[PDB]
Symmetry: D2
């Protein structure tokens, strides 16, 4: 049978690419390059609850597209970054970086600007058709903030945010209106961690926080009393222990962890990290999760084909543990791996020669 993935880019000209994966022949083909606002390339895209819409973090905009089929994607809107007044000036580096679409009513979209003037979250309501409708709220974090990823508890009552630059994890309560309200925050275990991503276990008992500079996954149990994550002291490496990781000409790290995501069954989780130089390899890791939610063990830590560039984002098939996609913008590959007997093996891939190609892949089909 055929499957389809959409992928965005880190650089203009903006476009959404549709790749087709044949799980029988085990091949990859680009079947469509859908043009979108030239200056609104999408570095992070996500589907709404019925995969009838695609929302994207697009440079200075939060865009919305209606999807009729893998090859019919129509731009329906592009909103500006809310919160701090200067977030939209074309002279500030503020950038739309992450986006999350609620799967339960009212299906609102929660978005995070990044870099300077990013001390707020942007909440958007959607129309009866799922189009990004109106910025209904700009809730504040702190002057310092740089959220790079969020996740809801299974009930979508609590929203957790990974604050990379403020080095902390925030907890918000989602009101019935879709609007949020602060509950609290916790600093990351170490000053050098820098939370970038967070994933949720299906029971709602555990949360996993990926530390970008710390290159590791930290385990959190969710306190039912407050709904806030508490560190269990368990962490796992996202880069080989002891690997040289300091740029001599910068003292800044050579590796930056990327993304973590659970597979369909909830029994596993894949994570990745990228290298800051093209001659270095990035890494991909796998974990097994106990039914109550704690991390049982790290199954693997292996080199990726490239440094991953700005990506190396892994994307598990939402309906089956069997497949996992990964994108890189160093060379521009969309690769597809098979998860079998707890070992990963590549089965197909395609290279897309375009500027900034390879930011993240999402499954439709």
């Amino acid at each position: 049978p055929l499957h389809h993935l959409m992928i965005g880019t880190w650089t203009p000209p903006g476009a959404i690419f549709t790749v087709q994966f044949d799980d029988e022949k085990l091949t990859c083909k680009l079947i469509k390059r859908t043009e979108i606002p030239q200056d609104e390339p999408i570095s992070w895209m996500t589907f709404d609850h019925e995969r009838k819409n695609i929302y994207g973090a697009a440079m200075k905009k939060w865009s919305s597209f209606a999807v009729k089929s893998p090859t019919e994607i129509v731009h329906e809107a592009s909103h500006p970054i809310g919160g701090h007044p200067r977030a939209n000036d074309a002279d500030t580096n503020t950038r739309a970086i992450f986006l999350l679409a609620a799967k339960q009513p009212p299906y609102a979209v929660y978005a995070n600007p990044f870099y300077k003037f990013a001390g707020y979250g942007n909440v958007f309501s959607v129309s009866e058709t799922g189009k990004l409708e109106k910025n209904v709220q700009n809730y504040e974090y702190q002057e310092n903030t740089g959220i790079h990823g969020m996740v809801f508890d299974p009930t979508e009552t609590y929203l957790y945010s990974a604050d990379l630059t403020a080095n902390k994890l925030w907890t918000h309560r989602k009101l019935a209106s879709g609007e949020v309200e602060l509950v609290g925050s916790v600093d990351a275990p170490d000053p050098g961690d820098h939370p970038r991503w967070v994933a949720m276990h299906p029971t709602g008992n555990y949360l996993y926080a990926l530390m970008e500079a710390g290159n590791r996954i930290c385990e959190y149990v969710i306190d039912p009393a407050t709904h806030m994550p508490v560190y269990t002291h368990h962490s796992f490496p996202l880069i080989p222990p002891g690997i040289p990781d300091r740029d001599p000409e910068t003292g800044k790290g050579l590796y930056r962890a990327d993304v973590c995501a659970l597979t369909f069954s909830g029994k596993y989780m894949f994570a990745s990290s990228r290298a800051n130089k093209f001659e270095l390899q990035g890494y991909i890791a796998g974990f097994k999760l106990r039914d109550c939610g704690s991390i049982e063990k790290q199954l693997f830590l292996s080199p990726t084909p490239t440094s991953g560039g700005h990506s190396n984002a892994v994307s598990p098939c939402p309906w089956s543990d069997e497949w996992m996609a990964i994108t890189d913008d160093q060379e521009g590959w969309l690769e597809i791996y098979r998860w079998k007997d707890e070992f990963l093996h590549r089965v197909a891939r395609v290279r897309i020669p375009e500027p900034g190609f390879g930011m993240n892949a999402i499954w439709y089909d």
Copy 2:
């Protein structure tokens, strides 16, 4: 070399027995029966920070003894139960059940009455010689309370209490004066658990709560933000899974978990449970602890020689992982086991033919 253990009884006449253990010949000899107030038998005794005093939960009294040597124990005082007015009436079943001696200044002693009218904790200051001096505070829990065990975090800033009858874990802050102040509480995971004991990991990261009726050890990570324990959803059986445990002429259970305690190194923990009928065997269990504090695995779950009676309390040597003592008041044995290559084997024992003998052993030497 010779070692010594003191043991109390569940029944009058009160007496403190000193047993001698030769770790070379691997033998046990009773070398002293120290008489104490006939009606103040000690069902739970503990040493002060220098093992120069022995404090005991003695029926209707909290007694204090000065210890010059294994054979020289001298009664120095006996205080009444504080808190509820009727706790001391000779017609109420209130009983002094557990006692804890702080190892950091001001070396106060925290005691817990049990059964009816036990909604308070009793704090005692001690003299310059370590004698129970004065009841400086009677802090309240709830009318419902029945604390049967407590433990301090490594810093002795926070005191955790196992509330058996109220089915919860309490957290208190210890002020510099030695007095406490409520922080909060959490209900046990299940209505049928009934916390009876709590142990602390040396890092202060984890706490272990032994559930009496639930016959299991539940793991708690300590939230550094509040100092309160949060359940990780990990538990371990203290009786064989599936074993018939309902008395058919009571519907009440047949097993009651007893005590849990870490070994000298902090790498292991032993726990036990007793049977409510003399023809049934009690059990002893062993666990290995990761350096961060979580429980790595259960090493063993084995039958004890007797049902354990009201005891089966395990007592690891405080200075070496190698030895562990256990007492029972069904037959009256003080047994000593050796812990070697993660297997336990009995090496010596002695029986004491006296009424209620065998409640708990404490190491001096």
Copy 3:
């Protein structure tokens, strides 16, 4: 439902006891004491392939009984020990010690005399009804031999013998006639091991040898080229590591490993050892087996209620992993345990006040 076990004795008067086990009420009742030749007590009994006959190692005789039901056991024959001329003299200590009944045609019975003048095996053919018919062969080992246990490969083409006094393992080929023929032998790994028992993995890939004086189970892979066992260098303790085990008035050991047996599924194996002094505890151990036959891990090593006396023989239910029986002749109990979630718990037991009672239990029903 009701189940039945038969048990013999180490001492006269000879008798076969039938115990009934109710797996619903979890109780034990002796329901029959079948008298047999007064001076032919059975220290080791086994059923034929249809459980229509019981064969026994009975002091100076190899006896045969027809079984119509749990309470109807009829003596049909008693043969003398074959091999060395003096084996049968009433003045020698030679004794019928072990017996094995083939489950494939011709259903012959293979028996081992023990102590002095025991350098031969005794093979008996059986009648059309399964009665011990005639000693068809007395095959030799060495003058030195003392076989205490044997086992066939799943095909019943090769017979392995545990030579305790010669400290070795023998391999024989079984001809179609039922008679054997030597293939070879191997010394036990250590001079102090003394093979006493051997069990076979269902695939025929592995064999387990229990060392009596070595108090351990040694793993053997069967070489398909020769059909002989080759030690893999893996062994497991049958008594706690480091436990004092040297009688200081003898220099001989304090513990003697007993028997090992696989459960119905072939996934597990239980083993036991006994203490040579009544005040010491014997032990029972459990192991998990990989599908290919190697021993994955030791699940437990626990004290038995008594020293086990001359027995402590464990007997897994042949049709279900759920139950296991053990006998002892110190106090005379037949105990029944349940195997659940890889933990063992006693569920019923009965004591039999007779001389030498408690040698081994076999399941009928």
Copy 4:
């Protein structure tokens, strides 16, 4: 400090390359290209017992070179292939493929021709200086034979050969003279395995056989009675389980396992396999070994940068577990990895633009 590795080629012009590795700066530099007989390129080289000589499998010759320093390598001799008459004809594909230098007196060299007319082994004595002196013996295997690797037991009394084309493992006894004598052989477990390489555990208890077409490591216990390897039924994958491995235009395998080798401490073993197409990744694997010799577990199975070409040979530092080198002749890299906390990470590498560069690396320094 500085270290040095020598590497050969799969293709003419023949040359030995000396690469320098700085373990402080973690860099690689080619510091010498020593020219050798143009038509004698070395596809497999090895050092003698003091690293004063280098012996090579060089196309139609077995060459010998004296080594004064990393940059001073002097050709001292080239012998023809012994055994079958046509092995040396320039019109036959027979090729010198593997070589092994004894480390105990008389320090003979054992060599294996490959492809057609390779039914013999070639034994060479060495001069008082370690130069390949004279072919003292051409011992036979079978018509069919194709030994691709051998290994001695720690004592250098028994020589084991991996017969790839005859699909078996041979055992030879080494006489004091250095000459050998057949002991026996065993077919590989499966017809599709094809033994290519064998490694030895320091205790001499176990031997590991790498199956080329089977893409797996099979474990063998060495029978002390015969000195022959017996399969334990334990095997580990050298390519991901389930990965497509059939060339539709050939029915022939897409993957071919390569080499296996223990690290300095004997606690670990690395192995590899190569892909038959340049667009496929090869694999590297790591195993942990129990002290008795069995394989405890597979630590990792990860993709290599290239298909490995004809190589992907891994070469652990003989004096420290910390480093491992790997060569490939697809792109021509000599990479160096660090083994730390049981994870592997690349630390340095250099590419050599020459024909057939990258067959295997050996450490001097």
